[PDB]
Each structure stands twice: as structure tokens, then as C-alpha cells.
């Protein structure tokens, strides 16, 4: 609900998707797929000011 | 599975209002995630092939040769607040109608059979 709580939950979810041992073989494609703007998740993170998200993704 | 949701948009206008209404329904799907109306609740657990919206009714088709229909009621003072009909009217199945395609017309719904039979029943009445 709160902005700080929302950001904390988002960071927790990103870390959860990072440390999911189940999705290891698919992450290689999950972080390599492109959106409609022709960019990876990392590029979208860095353009949308999601700088901590970009660091964790990298 | 799926969730049934409707939107209303004044006919003369640009596309920005439609896009804004779609954004509102998206936010409700995300910020609110309100449940769908009970009459279509059953059709939540069934697939859909094609849907048709008539002058006052709307018919929805399952992939298993089954159809359903329902009207609505829209409040203009308050302007999914639109509330559909109380009981969803079905299409009784006899000798394997096996619907494939449908069609929307002002005075009646149109349905197809596997062999091809232009079944139709008026919106006003309740008999094929």
C-alpha cells in the first residue's frame, strides 16, 4: 500500500526471482527476452530509473 | 480460467477516452482485482470462442458447442457498475446442435451448426 512498503515488496520479489533455483535454466532466456521497445529487462530497468533493480539484474 | 469485465464509452468521441477507460479497468484489475458478476461466474471456468453484443443482450459461446446469453442494465446517473440480468438464459440442447459460429443482429441472435443451420431466437422472447 505505502510507497516504501511497495518498494520493499518489489525489491523482495526481484530477489525472489533472482534466487529461485527452480528457474535457473529459464532465467538465461527470461533476462534475454525483449519487450516491444527492443530491449532486455536490464535496459528497461535502466531507462525507467529502476537503478537498484538494474544493479541487482546485472 | 478468466474474468469477465465490461466498459462503457460514449459513441461520438476520440480514442483517448477509450484508452483511459481501458486503463481504469486495468487498474481495477490490478489495484482492486474485483470479482466478476455472479451470472457470468460460471462462464469463468469455461473457455470462449466468440462473443456477440446485441442492442441489449450479449451471447457467449463455449468451444464445446454450448451457448449462453444475458442482457444488462447500465446506470447513467452513476457514470463494472453495469449489472447484467439476474439469471443467465441458456440454449437448450436437442440432438446435438453443435454450435460453431455466431452473429449479432438487432432483433435476434444467430447461431451455426456443424452441418450448417441458421438457428435464431429473438432477444425479446425465450424460444428458439
Amino acid at each position: 500500500v505505502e510507497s516504501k512498503d511497495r518498494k520493499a515488496n518489489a525489491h523482495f520479489i526481484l530477489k525472489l526471482l533472482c534466487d529461485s533455483v527452480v528457474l535457473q535454466p529459464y532465467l538465461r532466456e527470461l533476462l534475454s527476452a525483449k519487450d516491444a521497445r527492443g530491449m532486455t529487462p536490464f535496459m528497461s530497468a535502466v531507462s525507467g530509473r529502476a537503478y537498484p533493480a538494474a544493479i541487482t539484474i546485472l | 480460467m478468466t474474468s469477465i469485465h465490461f466498459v462503457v464509452h460514449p459513441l461520438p468521441g476520440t480514442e483517448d477516452q477509450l484508452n483511459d477507460r481501458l486503463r481504469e479497468v486495468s487498474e481495477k484489475l490490478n489495484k482492486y482485482n474485483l470479482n466478476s458478476h455472479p451470472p457470468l461466474n460460471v462462464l469463468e471456468q469455461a473457455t470462449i470462442k466468440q462473443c456477440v453484443v446485441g442492442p441489449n443482450h450479449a451471447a457467449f459461446l463455449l468451444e464445446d458447442g454450448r451457448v449462453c446469453r444475458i442482457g444488462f442494465s447500465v446506470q447513467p446517473d452513476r457514470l463494472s457498475p453495469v449489472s447484467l440480468g439476474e439469471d443467465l438464459q441458456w440454449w437448450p440442447d436437442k440432438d446435438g446442435t453443435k454450435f460453431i459460429c455466431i452473429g449479432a443482429l438487432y432483433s435476434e441472435l444467430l447461431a451455426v451448426s456443424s452441418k450448417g443451420e441458421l438457428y435464431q431466437w429473438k432477444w425479446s422472447e425465450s424460444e428458439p
Binding site: 520479489i13 526471482l17 527476452a33 529502476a50 | 470462449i48
Partner: protein, 66 residues
Amino acid sequence: IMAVEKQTLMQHILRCDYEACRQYLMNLEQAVVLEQNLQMLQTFISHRCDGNRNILHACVSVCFPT
């Protein structure tokens, strides 16, 4: 009228449900231990959003500065 789809983790991420996301991951990994949820997971991972956005795109897009 519309019938919006139902992709559970997509909704959880786009709504930022940390508890629900963790529960979904736990159930998925338990089922993978059961070895009966490999193909279904492979099909599910390709559940998308508007604009060919995979789950990670939703994750980052629900993380933009307020």
C-alpha cells in the same frame, strides 16, 4: 465486454504480492520435486503482458520510482 485471462504469477507480480509470489514459488518448487510440474512450468514461464513483456519486465516495471 471482455474476458481477461488468468496468469497467477503475472497478477501477483503486477500487484506486488510478496507473500503470494513466495507461496507460488514454494508450491512450484515442491511440485518440481514431485517431478510432475516440469512441462506446465515451461509453458507458464512464457505467460506475457501487453507488449511481449516476460515476468521480469513486470517485476522491474513495478519497481519504478514513485
